[PDB]
Amino acid sequence: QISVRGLAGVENVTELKKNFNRHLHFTLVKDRNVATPRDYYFALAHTVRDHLVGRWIRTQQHYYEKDPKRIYYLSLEFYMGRTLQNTMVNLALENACDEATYQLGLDMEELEEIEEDAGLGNGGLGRLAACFLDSMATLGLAAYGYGIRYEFGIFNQKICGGWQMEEADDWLRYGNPWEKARPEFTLPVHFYGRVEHTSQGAKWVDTQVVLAMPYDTPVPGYRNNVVNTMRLWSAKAPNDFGYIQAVLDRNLAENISRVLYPNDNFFEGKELRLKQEYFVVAATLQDIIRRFKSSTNFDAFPDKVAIQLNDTHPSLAIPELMRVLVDLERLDWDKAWEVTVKTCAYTNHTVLPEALERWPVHLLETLLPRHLQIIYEINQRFLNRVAAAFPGDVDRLRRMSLVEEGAVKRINMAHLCIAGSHAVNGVARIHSEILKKTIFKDFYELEPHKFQNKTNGITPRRWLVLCNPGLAEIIAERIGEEYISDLDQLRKLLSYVDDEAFIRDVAKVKQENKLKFAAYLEREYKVHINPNSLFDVQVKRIHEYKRQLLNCLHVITLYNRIKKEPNKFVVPRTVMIGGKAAPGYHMAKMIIKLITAIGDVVNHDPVVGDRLRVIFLENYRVSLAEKVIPAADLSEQISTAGTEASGTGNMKFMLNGALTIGTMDGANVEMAEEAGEENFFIFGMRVEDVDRLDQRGYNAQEYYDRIPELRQIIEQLSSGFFSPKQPDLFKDIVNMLMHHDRFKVFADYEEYVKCQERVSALYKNPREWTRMVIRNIATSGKFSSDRTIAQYAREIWGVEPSRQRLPAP
Amino acid sequence: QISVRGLAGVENVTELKKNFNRHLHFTLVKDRNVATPRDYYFALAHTVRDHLVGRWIRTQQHYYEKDPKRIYYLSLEFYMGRTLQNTMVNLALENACDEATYQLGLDMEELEEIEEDAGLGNGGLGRLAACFLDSMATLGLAAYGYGIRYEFGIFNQKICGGWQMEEADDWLRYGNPWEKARPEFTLPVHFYGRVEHTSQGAKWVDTQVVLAMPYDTPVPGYRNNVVNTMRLWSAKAPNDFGYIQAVLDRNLAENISRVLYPNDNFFEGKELRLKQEYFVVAATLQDIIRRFKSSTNFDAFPDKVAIQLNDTHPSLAIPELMRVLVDLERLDWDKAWEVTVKTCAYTNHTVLPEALERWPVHLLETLLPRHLQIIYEINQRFLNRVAAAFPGDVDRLRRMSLVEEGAVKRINMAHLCIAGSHAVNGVARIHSEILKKTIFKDFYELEPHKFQNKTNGITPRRWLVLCNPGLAEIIAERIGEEYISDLDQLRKLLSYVDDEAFIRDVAKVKQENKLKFAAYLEREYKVHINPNSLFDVQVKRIHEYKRQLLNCLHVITLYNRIKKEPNKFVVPRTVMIGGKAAPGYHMAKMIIKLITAIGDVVNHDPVVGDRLRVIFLENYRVSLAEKVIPAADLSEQISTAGTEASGTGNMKFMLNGALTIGTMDGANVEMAEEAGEENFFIFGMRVEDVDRLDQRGYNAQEYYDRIPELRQIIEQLSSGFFSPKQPDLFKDIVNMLMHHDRFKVFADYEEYVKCQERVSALYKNPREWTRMVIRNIATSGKFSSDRTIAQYAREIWGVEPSRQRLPAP
Numbered sequence A, B: 001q002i003s004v005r006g007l008a009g010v011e012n013v014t015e016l017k018k019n020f021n022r023h024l025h026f027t028l029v030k031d032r033n034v035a036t037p038r039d040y041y042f043a044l045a046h047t048v049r050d051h052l053v054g055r056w057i058r059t060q061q062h063y064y065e066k067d068p069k070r071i072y073y074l075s076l077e078f079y080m081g082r083t084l085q086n087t088m089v090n091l092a093l094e095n096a097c098d099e100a101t102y103q104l105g106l107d108m109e110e111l112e113e114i115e116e117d118a119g120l121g122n123g124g125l126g127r128l129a130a131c132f133l134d135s136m137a138t139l140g141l142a143a144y145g146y147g148i149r150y151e152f153g154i155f156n157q158k159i160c161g162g163w164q165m166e167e168a169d170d171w172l173r174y175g176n177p178w179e180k181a182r183p184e185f186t187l188p189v190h191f192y193g194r195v196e197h198t199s200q201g202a203k204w205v206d207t208q209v210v211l212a213m214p215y216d217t218p219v220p221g222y223r224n225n226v227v228n229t230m231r232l233w234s235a236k237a238p239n240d241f242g243y244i245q246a247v248l249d250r251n252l253a254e255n256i257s258r259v260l261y262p263n264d265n266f267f268e269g270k271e272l273r274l275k276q277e278y279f280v281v282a283a284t285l286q287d288i289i290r291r292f293k294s295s296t297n298f299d300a301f302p303d304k305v306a307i308q309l310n311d312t313h314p315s316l317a318i319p320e321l322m323r324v325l326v327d328l329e330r331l332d333w334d335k336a337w338e339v340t341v342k343t344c345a346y347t348n349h350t351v352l353p354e355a356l357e358r359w360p361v362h363l364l365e366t367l368l369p370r371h372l373q374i375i376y377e378i379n380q381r382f383l384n385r386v387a388a389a390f391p392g393d394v395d396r397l398r399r400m401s402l403v404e405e406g407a408v409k410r411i412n413m414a415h416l417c418i419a420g421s422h423a424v425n426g427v428a429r430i431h432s433e434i435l436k437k438t439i440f441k442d443f444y445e446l447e448p449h450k451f452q453n454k455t456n457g458i459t460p461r462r463w464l465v466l467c468n469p470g471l472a473e474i475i476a477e478r479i480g481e482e483y484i485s486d487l488d489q490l491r492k493l494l495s496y497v498d499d500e501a502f503i504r505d506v507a508k509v510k511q512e513n514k515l516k517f518a519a520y521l522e523r524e525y526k527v528h529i530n531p532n533s534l535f536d537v538q539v540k541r542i543h544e545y546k547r548q549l550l551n552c553l554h555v556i557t558l559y560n561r562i563k564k565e566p567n568k569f570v571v572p573r574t575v576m577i578g579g580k581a582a583p584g585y586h587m588a589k590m591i592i593k594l595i596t597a598i599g600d601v602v603n604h605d606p607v608v609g610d611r612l613r614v615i616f617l618e619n620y621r622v623s624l625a626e627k628v629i630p631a632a633d634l635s636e637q638i639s640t641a642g643t644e645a646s647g648t649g650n651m652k653f654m655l656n657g658a659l660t661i662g663t664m665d666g667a668n669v670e671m672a673e674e675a676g677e678e679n680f681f682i683f684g685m686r687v688e689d690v691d692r693l694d695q696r697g698y699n700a701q702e703y704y705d706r707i708p709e710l711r712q713i714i715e716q717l718s719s720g721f722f723s724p725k726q727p728d729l730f731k732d733i734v735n736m737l738m739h740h741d742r743f744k745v746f747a748d749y750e751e752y753v754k755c756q757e758r759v760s761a762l763y764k765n766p767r768e769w770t771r772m773v774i775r776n777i778a779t780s781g782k783f784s785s786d787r788t789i790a791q792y793a794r795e796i797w798g799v800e801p802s803r804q805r806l807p808a809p
């Protein structure tokens, strides 16, 4: 059908059809008479999977032959989403398969919707890991993703009575055709026990043993025949351990890989979480060292191994590597430490204090007694370095300590990571500067060479070609297909900004995507959106710092203005807000309810009509993002300046033809800088303004007293206008906004609504709104994760990316 | 190589080799460079499995077309063992595969030893279910095996310090290539709740829901292209149900199918067991009725459905069927009851009181409140029948009640089964008579037409062709291959009893099997048996009624006679005793220790030499039975007359060339009757003698006082002769034998040793021992499970067996 989807050869289609029938029969043990749509999806999934194996086997064999430096990306989260379509895209099998299934009388798109999302992530952090894997395979890096195989991923969100309800995400229920169990590579992981000091070294004894069984999932590069591996560990009880009760208690050791903690940017200090963190680290390092010993002086270890810590979650890799090198391999401390620092790199994702991992000492003490001793030794030698560099600065010593004194002693994992890594990076220019100027200023002054920046990116394969083929096609029609793996080329589209044919095409694609989504909204969930309105969307995890509340205030404002002047013309808008709240995050759950409560009033007001609709997108996840984003006109990125480290959803929207309304926060700053401030809807306080407000003190009352419209909104909320049967349902929200708003929603209210008026004004001029859209898409090249990864490879890992096709399949 | 293994066609071998390589590559994602023996076994298993699917699909389609009467065999146990070789044998693929793997440079036998046993059974009861499935497929019956998919089967036994140690049987660890998950057929099962009586009928509400997910395993008939199905249910928690804790508590509902209770002939009244029993029944009946409604007056139900209860474990099927018919389908009681009785049949397996299921009322009351009401109603109407038939016999009423009064009210499941079934059968002639004359005499007098006999059998495919190809070949050389599915033909071998060539062949096969096992004993476990000695073996579960202790006394006697007269000639014997003890069966565990303690003395006595060896076969299971049995010379079947309902190991030994020493118990009686008493080593009390001893009272002291040799043995045990460091280690054993021996070991001691002397005497005459062996093998035809199943089909289920090949694959 469309160019970018590959050729549908005569031989290829014929071969696909027979292998499809082969799997339906031999693999699924079914025949055309009793097969259900799910059986067809599996037949197709196995057929596509067959095309990967050859490449997967020789890619791994290749690395064994040439023995290049290996990159190990440790993360407790990999937000993969679906993999069928992505695999077809990267293998150029999409049209062949579409055609082959067509001839077999099946709609391929209908079959793809059957695939369960691999939601092993919460949000930004987890998705970045996923985009990174794709880019590393595309750039020919010998990389491995390591994590935990949760049998229950992020919970599926249900809205009942306007409230969020959580239900287990049993994504493995029907099976996963992409993973390959490797029980022959099972490794033992130790917990508890105690430390014995013998003649020659310390020993960790009397430990509880849990087995780590690996599951490999192929990660195909874009049309280069490279297939890397994502290895996910599963917890298994040793056969060692009433008889019946003993057998049933095995489900105590295996609970370690049972479920993903659903916290986005929040630290919950539960023991089960620490176990997961150590579990993934202990098993991974053994696998790493084993693979290394094959390639025993570890001086070359850093030249053959790079370990990237995606946040502090896998920070125990630092003391664990030291433990193995010192306790088992018997290297002297200093040598081991040099080695550790040279192979580890740490990526910071947020500056919010409630997100920082600070593990109580009594916990590490009981669970990992040997690691605690190593941590104290590391801390001891590190503070000696600080004291020698800043004699007499005793306060600096307690501020930089890995050990935090107070109510209960805690270990600051972020300080541990900085000390044991040769590189520390932020995820956006502004975020990285903030790290050097505030949160980690003492560390920066001590070792300025460690601090770097690596602005985040998204993969153009899943985030353009896969979810927006229509847009990918009209672009390719003009500049070719080369941009798919070199997004910078999108700049060439800048010379089509005045091209009347292109203007019409870009706008036509957006309209088709909106009709497509508007339909999906009725087919599933039976809604009533009007395709002609401006699609105003904000999708991301529910957070006070993300300020979904600032969006709500604008929605209520728009509503009150319509009711005030009913017969005045206003640009039609469908505001869509979606996202999950962490189960124990009360304020976030109240916000979801407020959103649906506003929709209950606004959507049933006869005077409003189809001029304003408020929809809450249920169960926002990766596969839902692939549908909404391509259909969006306005992208809401309105976090308080200085809180959103980078953000990545913002990039997805810019690449798919939506204009952006936001604050100068995270990557928003670099995006506006690339597209030009005139092509961006910027508003609100900058980082400096927030600081000046804090010096003086933030008093929400002041804004409530001076802005009539804001006052009316707060009064409607307190009087029960949006909750008739429950007059004070939103007392917590009002109370928070008025007395303890850490994110100063009111401070940005006035500039936000005025900026929204500028958006409605531009929308009334179709031609100009589209030319601005083109200006955005054309300058989004910098935000490709290929660029991000190439910088990591060159400035942190010491490896050169390659675009060379691997010697065929 | 050998005839009975099929042809190794040129096309066939070539096709097998390429599909093998296809699976190693595409399925296992490996190449010849990194594949391990386990990968080769899986490649082969998938290759063989591919040959079943075609047949499996059309066999099920066939039944759907013709719609014959369906047989449902409900059992909580299916002792399958390995399935690779059995599948090749039934598909005539054994030589083709042996050859194909040979050309690929692999030893097929080495690969088969890698397969994990499917030990979803304890012993006799579970193995019978397995043999039955094989015979039903071979006789072309539309049969389905229904049970539970335990993720942990019978425990693996380890001997430490002479003691049994149990360790989880994680048989699914590396995966099971034979099963096919059918998550699309998941059914809900209800527990707890309460009963509401509404205008029109009773309702069971507020129940806890557990999901039943089925896994299908193919059951191939012998060379007839029929492939039936064994459906095993797995417990899954509904997605309905702190957030983390809620997700982790799902492993409370799924524990139902976690592990098999390891009790052989013993009732343990734990709630988890009752749950398993209801779980398998509730899910199965829904599947049965659903399949029936397709083929709504249930008058035809009995003509389309037969449900066989393998013991009382699935007895809840009776009140559950009534519940569905009355509460859901709304049929009147009497109609529903007629239907139930006509479709259900019950098989009794033992008369030992400690084995009888008597569920406390308070348990059924809480877990299955509605079933309790149905049971009381059934009981009420049944006792009304008894009273009308025996007016005034009030004692008969309390003896026949399904409800048992006393300390705690209990429900007698055996009485429930007899009342709700149209047929009740024993498993051996003597056992069935005992049921009518004692244990169920009142029921027999009330409905004599319900009581039948169906002597057990073993499948000649797994128990001859598979484990003893050498013997199968020399037999076929003389009478053809027809006997494999018509064992009666073995009688033709009676005319070769004087044939010098056959005598030599039969004896040669036994010798090769012994060398083969003697090697296996050293290769694994490093032992030291002498292939020239008489192989005296007793393998079965450890039980006081099986009397492994009577065997021990003989062993100690033989030892004491050698020490008394060292330079006297005695026939060399290697006595092998093996079997598992239930974890909580203290006496059984003490017996295992006694056995190894005797071996520790006997095996290291210089004066004994290689004249007497005592070995304890570790982890006796189905695959180990396939090795020992073919190598045995003497089969020990020495249970106290009246305790072993039938036994099946006895039949396996008779078919493989071992002579039998035993009591007139169970099927031993029919075996001696078939071979002729002169060709059997019978000894001990008969059932009548045991009763006369009980009338008078059994006083072990009397035997201890009158038999010098027995006295010496008991004194060696009490003085610590066999336990030096622990003088009184065996005080429980001695105490039991002397004061509370329910199985009167001493009463049979004298006749047992004298009979053992007759065995040694015959062994010294190779030619005559072998001619007697031939007489046994030639008359073992009656004990084929094909005969047993044909009788079940004709006299209980109302279906005709067929030997017609199904229309090719």
Ligand SMILES: O=C1Nc2ccc(S(=O)(=O)O)cc2/C1=C1/Nc2ccccc2C1=O
Binding pocket: A262, A263, A264, A265, A266, A268, A354, A544, A582, A583, A584, A585, A586
């Ligand atoms: O994200 C989260 N997950 C959980 C889980 C459980 C709790 S609990 O209240 O401590 O039980 C709290 C939280 C939680 C939270 N997230 C936030 C974000 C900003 C301010 C306060 C909290 C908070 O308590």
Ligand SMILES: O=C1Nc2ccc(S(=O)(=O)O)cc2/C1=C1/Nc2ccccc2C1=O
Binding pocket: B262, B263, B264, B265, B266, B268, B354, B544, B582, B583, B584, B585, B586
């Ligand atoms: O086979 C078995 N399994 C178990 C499991 C647990 C127990 S417990 O002693 O009640 O804990 C007892 C048993 C048990 C038993 N089997 C037998 C057979 C003959 C006489 C007494 C017992 C006995 O207690």
Ligand SMILES: *Cc1c(COP(=O)(O)O)cnc(C)c1O
Binding pocket: A122, A123, A124, A127, A539, A540, A541, A620, A621, A622, A625, A646, A647, A648, A649, A650, A652
């Ligand atoms: C990209 C993405 C995110 C991150 O969005 P932000 O707006 O940066 O917080 C979260 N969830 C999903 C499913 C995404 O695809």
Ligand SMILES: *Cc1c(COP(=O)(O)O)cnc(C)c1O
Binding pocket: B122, B123, B124, B127, B539, B540, B541, B620, B621, B622, B625, B646, B647, B648, B649, B650, B652
């Ligand atoms: C046949 C068999 C049994 C039954 O043996 P009996 O001597 O009748 O008790 C038990 N276990 C296994 C593994 C068997 O194959």
